[PDB]
Amino acid sequence: KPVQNGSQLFIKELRSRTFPSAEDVVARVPGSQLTLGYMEEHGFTEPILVPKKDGLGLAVPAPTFYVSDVENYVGPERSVDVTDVTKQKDCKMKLKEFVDYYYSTNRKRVLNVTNLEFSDTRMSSFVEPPDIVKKLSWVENYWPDDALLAKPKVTKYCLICVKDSYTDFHIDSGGASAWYHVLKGEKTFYLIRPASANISLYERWRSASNHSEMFFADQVDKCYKCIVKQGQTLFIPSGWIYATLTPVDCLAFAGHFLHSLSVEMQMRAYEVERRLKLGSLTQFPNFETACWYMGKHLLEAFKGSHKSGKQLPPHLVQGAKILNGAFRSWTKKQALAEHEDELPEHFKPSQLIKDLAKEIRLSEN
Numbered sequence: 001k002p003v004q005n006g007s008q009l010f011i012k013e014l015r016s017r018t019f020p021s022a023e024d025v026v027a028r029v030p031g032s033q034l035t036l037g038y039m040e041e042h043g044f045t046e047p048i049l050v051p052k053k054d055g056l057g058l059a060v061p062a063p064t065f066y067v068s069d070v071e072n073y074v075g076p077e078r079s080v081d082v083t084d085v086t087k088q089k090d091c092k093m094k095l096k097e098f099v100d101y102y103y104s105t106n107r108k109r110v111l112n113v114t115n116l117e118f119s120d121t122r123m124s125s126f127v128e129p130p131d132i133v134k135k136l137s138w139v140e141n142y143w144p145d146d147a148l149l150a151k152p153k154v155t156k157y158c159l160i161c162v163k164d165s166y167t168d169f170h171i172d173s174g175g176a177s178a179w180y181h182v183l184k185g186e187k188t189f190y191l192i193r194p195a196s197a198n199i200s201l202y203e204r205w206r207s208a209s210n211h212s213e214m215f216f217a218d219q220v221d222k223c224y225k226c227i228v229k230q231g232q233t234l235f236i237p238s239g240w241i242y243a244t245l246t247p248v249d250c251l252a253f254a255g256h257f258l259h260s261l262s263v264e265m266q267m268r269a270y271e272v273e274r275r276l277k278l279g280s281l282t283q284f285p286n287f288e289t290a291c292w293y294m295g296k297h298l299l300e301a302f303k304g305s306h307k308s309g310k311q312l313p314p315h316l317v318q319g320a321k322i323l324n325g326a327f328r329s330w331t332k333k334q335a336l337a338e339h340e341d342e343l344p345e346h347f348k349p350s351q352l353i354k355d356l357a358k359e360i361r362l363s364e365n
């Protein structure tokens with residue numbers, strides 16, 4: 001009998017496996033140093049661990065905040081997605097019910113909540129994402145507060161994982177980057193770099209009928225183990241393929257964002273996830289819409305480069321090329337139908353595309 005991912009035996013095997021340490025890959029950085037300058041210099045191509053929250057501008061409740069507290073501020077009747085780790089299947093249930101299980105003295109099942117976005121609850125005011133995320137985020141910067149399309153609801157997640165919880169290898173939707181803060185307990189990440197072959201292997205693995213029977217890390221050269229302890233915050237870059245294991249009961253907060261340093265990888269991940277057709281519950285809503293607003297921003301910046309005679313940085317110009325390629329593919333008449341639903345009000349795609357194309361020609365010279 002083949003071992004299924006998430007099963008009791010798998011977890012035992014996994015705990016015994018040795019992995020290269022995240023030491024050579026994950027930078028340890030003090031919160032006050034994680035600046036926009038730092039991101040630009042290093043380019044956010046590898047995860048970053050911030051051992052203490054000081055300097056991050058991160059707002060979170062004290063460690064004396066419990067799952068019972070989440071129930072109160074979120075709402076006991078609130079429906080939630082619950083993952084049965086051993087089956088590797090998802091279901092729905094009231095939060096009060098999950099909480100009743102969580103506090104059970106003899107849990108039979110291994111169940112977690114890893115999709116609870118609480119920006120629309122009373123608990124929202126208790127959590128504020130790190131300053132660096134707000135500075136990098138496309139939605140935070142370029143999506144108007146008066147927009148008719150609702151902003152992607154991906155900014156404040158509460159994760160509750162019991163001991164022995166496992167989340168299998170995945171790339172986050174939209175190739176989005178993540179901040180992940182452990183309030184109580186600890187969370188182990190197994191991190192795989194999005195080198196081109198690795199992404200291709202991931203796509204082939206995720207699309208295979210027997211994928212829940214195969215340990216993905218067996219197929220790549222390096223899978224790095226990174227333990228994130230209480231009070232620590234991990235920043236995961238675009239496109240990284242990762243799984244997690246929960247060694248002790250864990251409560252954590254996280255958010256997802258897109259940014260200008262990984263336009264290429266963001267599109268690549270999006271293309272992969274579109275080919276996979278997972279119809280996820282964790283999909284990045286209105287990813288295309290965020291790209292459209294980025295596109296309008298770039299056109300404005302280019303126009304602004306003509307008033308100063310100061311050219312845009314090369315990564316933006318390249319970002320423009322990649323986005324403009326997307327806009328074209330999304331609006332070819334053979335395509336409109338499904339993609340038009342994400343177009344913001346008052347956008348004229350064929351004009352934007354032509355204006356961006358011209359501006360890029362001029363920038364190149």
Ligand SMILES: O=C(O)CNC(=O)C(=O)O
Pocket residue numbers: 114157159161166167172178180187244245252254
């Ligand atoms: O909490 C976990 O173990 C898994 N979390 C996620 O993959 C995430 O927040 O995007």
Ligand SMILES: [Cl-]
Pocket residue numbers: 137138139140256257258259290
């Ligand atoms: Cl964003």
Ligand SMILES: [Fe+3]
Pocket residue numbers: 170171172
């Ligand atoms: Fe994830």
